[PDB]
Amino acid sequence: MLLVKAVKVLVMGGCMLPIAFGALGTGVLFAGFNVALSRNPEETESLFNNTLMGFALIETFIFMSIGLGFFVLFA
Amino acid sequence: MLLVKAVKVLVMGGCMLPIAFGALGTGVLFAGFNVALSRNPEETESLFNNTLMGFALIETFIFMSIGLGFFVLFA
Amino acid sequence: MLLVKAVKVLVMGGCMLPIAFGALGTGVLFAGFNVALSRNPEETESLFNNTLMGFALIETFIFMSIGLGFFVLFA
Amino acid sequence: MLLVKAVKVLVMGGCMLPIAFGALGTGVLFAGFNVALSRNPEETESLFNNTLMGFALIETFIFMSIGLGFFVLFA
Amino acid sequence: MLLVKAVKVLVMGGCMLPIAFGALGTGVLFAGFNVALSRNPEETESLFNNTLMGFALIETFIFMSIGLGFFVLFA
Amino acid sequence: PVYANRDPETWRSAQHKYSKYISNFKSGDGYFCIPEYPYAGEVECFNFFVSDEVWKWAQHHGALSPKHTFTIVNANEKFVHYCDSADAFIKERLEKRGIRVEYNTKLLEVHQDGQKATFINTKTGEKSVRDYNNLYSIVPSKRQEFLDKAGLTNGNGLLN
Amino acid sequence: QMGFSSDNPYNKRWEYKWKHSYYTYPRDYEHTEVRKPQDSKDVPPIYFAYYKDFVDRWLPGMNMWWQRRHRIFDKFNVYFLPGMSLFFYQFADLALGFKIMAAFPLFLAYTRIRDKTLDPDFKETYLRDMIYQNPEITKYFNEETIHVLDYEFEYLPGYLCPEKFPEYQNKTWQFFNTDTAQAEGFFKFGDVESGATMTLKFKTMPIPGKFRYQVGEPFYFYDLRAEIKCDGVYKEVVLVDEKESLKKIRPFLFLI
Amino acid sequence: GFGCFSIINYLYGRYGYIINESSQKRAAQDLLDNDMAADKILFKNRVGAPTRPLRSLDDMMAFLSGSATYDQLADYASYNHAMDVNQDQQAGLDSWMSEKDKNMVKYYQRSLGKKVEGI
Amino acid sequence: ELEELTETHNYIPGAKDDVNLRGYLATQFAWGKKVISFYRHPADDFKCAKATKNMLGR
Numbered sequence A, B, C, D, E: 001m002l003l004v005k006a007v008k009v010l011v012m013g014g015c016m017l018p019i020a021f022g023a024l025g026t027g028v029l030f031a032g033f034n035v036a037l038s039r040n041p042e043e044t045e046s047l048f049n050n051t052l053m054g055f056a057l058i059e060t061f062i063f064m065s066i067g068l069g070f071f072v073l074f075a
Numbered sequence F: 001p002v003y004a005n006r007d008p009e010t011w012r013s014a015q016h017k018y019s020k021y022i023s024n025f026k027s028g029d030g031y032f033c034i035p036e037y038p039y040a041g042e043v044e045c046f047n048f049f050v051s052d053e054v055w056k057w058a059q060h061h062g063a064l065s066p067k068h069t070f071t072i073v074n075a076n077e078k079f080v081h082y083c084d085s086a087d088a089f090i091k092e093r094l095e096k097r098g099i100r101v102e103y104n105t106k107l108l109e110v111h112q113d114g115q116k117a118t119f120i121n122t123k124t125g126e127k128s129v130r131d132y133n134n135l136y137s138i139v140p141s142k143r144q145e146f147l148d149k150a151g152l153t154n155g156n157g158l159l160n
Numbered sequence G: 001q002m003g004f005s006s007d008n009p010y011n012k013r014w015e016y017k018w019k020h021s022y023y024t025y026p027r028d029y030e031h032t033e034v035r036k037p038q039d040s041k042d043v044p045p046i047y048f049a050y051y052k053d054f055v056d057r058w059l060p061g062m063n064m065w066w067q068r069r070h071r072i073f074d075k076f077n078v079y080f081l082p083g084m085s086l087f088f089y090q091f092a093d094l095a096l097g098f099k100i101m102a103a104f105p106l107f108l109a110y111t112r113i114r115d116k117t118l119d120p121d122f123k124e125t126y127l128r129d130m131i132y133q134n135p136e137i138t139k140y141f142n143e144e145t146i147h148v149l150d151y152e153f154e155y156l157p158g159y160l161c162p163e164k165f166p167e168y169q170n171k172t173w174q175f176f177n178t179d180t181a182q183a184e185g186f187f188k189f190g191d192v193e194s195g196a197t198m199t200l201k202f203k204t205m206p207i208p209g210k211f212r213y214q215v216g217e218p219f220y221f222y223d224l225r226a227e228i229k230c231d232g233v234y235k236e237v238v239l240v241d242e243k244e245s246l247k248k249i250r251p252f253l254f255l256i
Numbered sequence H: 001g002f003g004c005f006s007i008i009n010y011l012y013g014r015y016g017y018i019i020n021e022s023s024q025k026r027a028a029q030d031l032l033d034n035d036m037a038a039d040k041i042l043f044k045n046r047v048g049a050p051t052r053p054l055r056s057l058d059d060m061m062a063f064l065s066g067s068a069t070y071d072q073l074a075d076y077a078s079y080n081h082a083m084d085v086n087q088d089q090q091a092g093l094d095s096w097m098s099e100k101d102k103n104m105v106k107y108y109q110r111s112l113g114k115k116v117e118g119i
Numbered sequence I: 001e002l003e004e005l006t007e008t009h010n011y012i013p014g015a016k017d018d019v020n021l022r023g024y025l026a027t028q029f030a031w032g033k034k035v036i037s038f039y040r041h042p043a044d045d046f047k048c049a050k051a052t053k054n055m056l057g058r
């Protein structure tokens, strides 16, 4: 119990890995949105919406991990 | 016995590794969408329809990992 | 004995590494497909064909490892 | 004995690492083949052949790794 | 004794790391060849020869590692 | 169904006709022609021993008609000129397998319309016409004059 | 001969080809004349839809297998596959793999019995393209004015003469086949514009094409003859002669 | 394929001892020989727990090559009370132990359902 | 006419009308603006399937 609990909490730390890759995926995404915006600003709003939209797909994995994290942390 | 259990949970944490790369792969996919959209927005629908399709395959593997995750945790 | 089993279950977890690279590798292939499409959307057919074919080889390696995983887990 | 045996099966798992990079390497190769095609789709057969050839060389490493695996697993 | 023998087997597995990067490096090189080929396919023979040469130099490092592996495995 | 020893330069990477000589021999008369010595590919291009084994299977399950004919048309008198041990072994093995041979006969013309092959017996100077359905020939060589005009070759046309 | 035949009088050479969109079968068979309300039975009996499916779909399907039963009596279907099924059927209770390896040879037999009992269908569009390219036929026949008076096409039984077709004297091929897979038939044609009639006799056999293992054309016309008859002129056209065709191409000898 | 795989899996169940029973008897006594050697060279504290397997290289191998070495140490680390006692010893509270206190882990193993003798 | 549609299970509105004006009025702001194809039956299925050298029929 206490022995397995120790590795349980350790696994919960692993959930902070997507938190890292999600940040990098964000920095890269908005970079493409900016450079792409400059080449064709006529559709700014279109690009902008798709930008945040894409980001929503990033925090997806984030919440999924934390959910899976606390789950195995107690299941 | 108790050791393999501590390893079973440890492996279940590793399942959050694709959850990390899936986020990064998304920011890259959506970045290409913006640049591709700014390049030729007249063909948005085609460029777009292919985007979600790719993403569907992306998180499919993510769910697949969770499958093997709970398997080794209970099998 | 017991430890060798503990390592076997661990090696089974390592199989989720290609699962991570497959997601990133997939986002990249579909990222370029978008841009490659916007550059010349007239050739949707050929480009799209090459996408899934490439995707096949990508996922082929994914399940190859999973097969290798269960193998070492019971052999 | 069992310790050396534990490392044997452990290395057998490590062979799945090139499998991950082989998946990523494949997406990059085909992503370029797509872009390379949209640029000048006149050379489908040429670009297509050069693509699969490079992919064949990749499987050489993949199979080479697995070969090294079973070898070290029993020798 | 048995411990150093175990590490010898462990280092033998480490040789699969260049194998992974060698596979990824192969896809990258051929991707550059494909795109560089479609842009100027008239001189395919030149680009083609330079490609395989690089691939040979890549396997050079690959074979070096394996050679290094068996060396420390028995020396 | 006319095949040769080398591939022309007009074939692309998608043409594999070379590999269909043994496969696509469902029936008919087959002729393996050898030109007059000197020629290139004496022993490295002799594929009449693999075809026999592959065609022995076709007769077993019916892929190859039972009324077929395969004969080796050798313009020369011996297969290996500068090695009697090898040539004696070949002629010994060809008979053991059941293959027929015709010496002093060289291919002369090929009609692509009606599949007619014109052979000529250099010994008797008698030419004949034979229907073919799977024809293989080793490309014949030819002496270059610039080496004879300079007075370097000797006889056949090889360097002295 | 057409194996699949119901009591329906019309379109006998298309009964197995036509895929109707009916939920069930029509109350009566296609009328050949205008009938009276009392000639037919209102509100047909109970369980009529099931009866029709048996006499219009099941029964003519079994009449096809019975009509061409001589093509499935090979030692492979008769002894080998049933014997293979009994060998594993004795161990069916030990594991599931025995149930499978015992039923597979039965599913394999049904597939060979299924394909071998079907009516032999040649590529009729290839045929009409061949005769309409001949000038001696287009002089009296045209697709806009031609009509069919009779049609016959059936497999030939047993092995043929072992001098014209020595291929079939192969004990390995005989183990799988009792028939030749060749077919013979004719076509009774008429032209309503010119008033001409001709009997288009043809013999077919399977041939290999361009590949090693697969058949190219299961029904290749190696003999195609037309005996044209007009007001007072009789012509005999030979589109494909067997003496010249059998010297170039040989049959295929299906296995399995 | 399923037919062959499902069959060989049965023959290996019904039969199979014809060729592997020797390797099983070999690993049986071998698993007892290394266990017997572990008890000879291993630090057992006042309770039967190998708390110092890293004392030397031979102890590390004897601990890994054993079957019960993982259990005697895991069941001890899982008993919250025995770890509470150890936490007190580290702080400076220690004393002598009776025969009943020495078996505190054996009582814990028995409660889980383990078959332990010598209480 | 309404009975014939019901008895033939042509219960897709406007399928047998050459100009399904009612369908255009209902799709003026629909996503993927489309009207039912002419004489479309809810039971017909023209789906095909092929196998090629490549996967997924490509």
Ligand SMILES: CCCCCCCCCCCCCCCCCC(=O)OC[C@H](COP(=O)([O-])OCC[N+](C)(C)C)OC(=O)CCCCCCCCCCCCCCCCC
Binding pocket: G015, G016, G017, G018, G019, G020, G057, G058, G061, G062, G065
């Ligand atoms: C020891 C006992 C023997 C084993 C018992 C086996 C029972 C077999 C009968 C029940 C199974 C029915 C399954 C049918 C599923 C497919 C539908 C179908 O039938 O398609 C027909 C199809 C009809 O054609 P079709 O449906 O493929 O396409 C028709 C195309 N159009 C519409 C254009 C016309 O024909 C066949 O499949 C071939 C005939 C198969 C015959 C089926 C088995 C008949 C068994 C006869 C002997 C039974 C003796 C017992 C009687 C004793 C006296 C009481």
Ligand SMILES: CCCCCCCCCCCCCCCCCC(=O)OC[C@H](COP(=O)([O-])OCC[N+](C)(C)C)OC(=O)CCCCCCCCCCCCCCCCC
Binding pocket: B049, I030, I031, I032, I033
């Ligand atoms: C409470 C009563 C019960 C209600 C039951 C459900 C009611 C359903 C109401 C009808 C709407 C159904 C949505 C269908 C999608 C219509 C939009 C569309 O076609 O996409 C075009 C869209 C929109 O194109 P557009 O040009 O028309 O609109 C663009 C919108 N703006 C203007 C804002 C940009 O474009 C696409 O091509 C996307 C293609 C993907 C569409 C995804 C379809 C997924 C669903 C299909 C599977 C469903 C089968 C379920 C079977 C279950 C069997 C058990």
Ligand SMILES: Nc1ncnc2c1ncn2[C@@H]1O[C@H](COP(=O)(O)OP(=O)(O)OP(=O)(O)O)[C@@H](O)[C@H]1O
Binding pocket: G017, G121, G122, G123, G124, G125, G126
């Ligand atoms: N080009 C095609 N593409 C897709 N499916 C096809 C094609 N040709 C045939 N099929 C399918 O295979 C079936 C059989 O084809 P087949 O040519 O034998 O029909 P057929 O009526 O006998 O033609 P014909 O009258 O010329 O003899 C067809 O009913 C069809 O479902």
Ligand SMILES: [Mg+2]
Binding pocket: G121, G122, G123, G124
């Ligand atoms: Mg037909």
